Every structure is written in structure tokens, then in C-alpha cells.
Design a protein around this ligand. Structure first.
Ligand code: CA
Length: 245
């Protein structure tokens, strides 16, 4: 349905954060972090684009919150937990299952799980994500996570998703990634994307896309995005990491 804020709704954008799951798993492994079922359970899939999973949907800094002294960096660090407001409990990556249950329906949880391996189970990524980016806005969890699922699907089905699939395990240039994104959404919207990489050579771990809050409930189009200042830390070229360490 439609995603709507009940409070602090005066933000202008959402950042759709999509993990390149294989890369995420590779990174956790390279940094010597204990393996989460997510990754050890991770297998090769027929549609390589399906490795592009949902991390979250992050509302930008609300004007009402910025008005109270909160800057962009502080909002990025604590989200709903920023002080003086919204001042909700801080969501911590070290205890995601300690965040409140979201109240998400079984149906939405099922859909969410297929594209967010960290959701539910003993990981509870959705509890953390909702606590940090949705609770203070009073978002309906079903509309919230349902929207992430849809947006992720639209990205995977676009030339950006096809680009990742066609170049699975290969080294690509940011130039060509941008060309693919631009093919589906326009050259002037290439700036709406921030890529995150790990290692050297760099390999993809995440894609963050800035979307107009006004367009969040409609199918993505060349009028749905907002340029943002950060291209990311991938450099000119990077590897589309394949499953397996
Ligand atoms: Ca890998």
C-alpha cells in the first residue's frame, strides 16, 4: 500500500540501501567476523540479480529534527535515536534482536525474508532497521517493508540489476555501471547512487539510491531520484563479487 509518516514527516528523501549480498558476506569474512547463517546458508542462485538484497529504506534528515540542531552526520549515525529528538532508544547492531518486534504481518515477513536474508530468525535485521529508521515516523511496518521489497525488485529488473547479473564475478567500471543505471533512469540520476566496496581490488558490497520522498509510493521513473554528494569508495573499477569466499 502507501508508506506514510505520522510524525517528523518533513524529510525530502529516502535512501534505499541494497546489499550486494555475496559481497557483504565476503566482507564479513575478510574482516574476520563470525559467519551469520545468512552467509554460510548463502548459495548460488539462478538469477544473479537476486544477490541484490534489501538492507533498508532510510528517511533523510527531517527538517523538524534538523531544526533542533541535528546535522546530517548525526542523523546518519543514530537515526530515530538522535537527541534532542526524536530521542528513541538507540538501535544497536550488536543486539538487533533486542529492538522491538515490528508487528509486521506474516505475509510481509515472508516476502521480506526472500529478499532480506538477515530478517527474522536469529538476526532480526528488520527490528534494527525499523527501530533506527521507521519507528520515530510511525510507519506501518507492512507498508514500510513492503515498499522496500518492491523498490528492490524494480532495481533488480532494471538495467542496473541486469548489469550486475551479466557481470557476475567480473570487474566492471563505474562508467559502465552508471551507463546501465542511466539507460533505465537517465544520466542526470546517476548521481543518486552511492556504491560501497570492500577490499583491494574493490568488490561491491552495497548500492544506496536516493529517492524523492514524494515519489516513494510510485513505480520508479526518471523523476523519482535525487542527486546526492557521495559516489562511494569503489573507485573507477570494482568486482561484482560471486558467491563463495
Ligand atoms: Ca565472494
Amino acid at each position: 500500500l502507501a508508506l506514510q509518516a505520522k510524525q517528523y514527516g518533513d524529510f525530502d528523501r529516502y535512501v534505499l540501501a541494497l546489499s550486494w549480498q555475496t559481497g557483504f558476506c565476503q566482507s564479513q569474512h575478510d574482516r574476520n567476523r563470525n559467519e551469520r547463517d545468512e552467509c554460510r546458508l548463502q548459495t548460488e542462485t539462478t538469477n544473479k540479480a537476486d544477490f541484490l538484497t534489501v538492507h533498508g529504506l532510510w528517511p533523510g534528515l527531517p527538517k523538524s529534527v534538523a531544526a533542533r540542531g541535528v546535522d546530517e552526520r548525526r542523523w546518519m549515525r543514530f537515526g530515530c535515536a538522535t537527541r534532542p529528538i526524536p530521542n528513541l532508544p538507540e538501535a544497536r547492531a550488536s543486539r538487533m534482536c533486542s529492538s522491538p518486534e515490528t508487528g509486521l504481518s506474516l505475509e510481509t515477513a515472508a516476502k521480506l525474508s526472500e529478499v532480506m536474508p538477515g530478517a527474522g530468525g536469529r538476526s532480526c535485521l528488520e527490528r534494527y532497521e525499523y527501530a533506527k529508521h521507521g519507528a520515530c515516523f510511525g510507519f506501518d511496518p507492512d507498508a514500510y517493508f513492503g515498499t522496500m521489497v518492491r523498490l528492490n525488485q524494480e532495481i533488480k529488473e532494471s538495467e542496473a540489476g541486469k548489469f550486475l547479473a551479466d557481470n557476475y564475478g567480473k570487474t566492471v567500471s563505474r562508467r559502465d555501471f552508471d551507463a546501465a543505471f542511466a539507460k533505465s533512469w537517465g544520466k542526470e540520476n546517476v548521481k543518486a547512487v552511492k556504491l560501497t566496496c570492500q577490499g583491494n581490488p574493490a568488490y561491491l558490497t552495497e548500492i544506496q539510491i536516493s529517492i524523492k520522498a514524494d515519489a516513494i509510493n510510485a513505480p520508479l521513473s526518471a523523476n523519482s531520484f535525487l542527486p546526492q554528494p557521495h559516489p562511494g569508495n569503489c573507485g573507477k573499477t570494482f568486482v561484482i563479487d560471486k558467491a563463495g569466499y
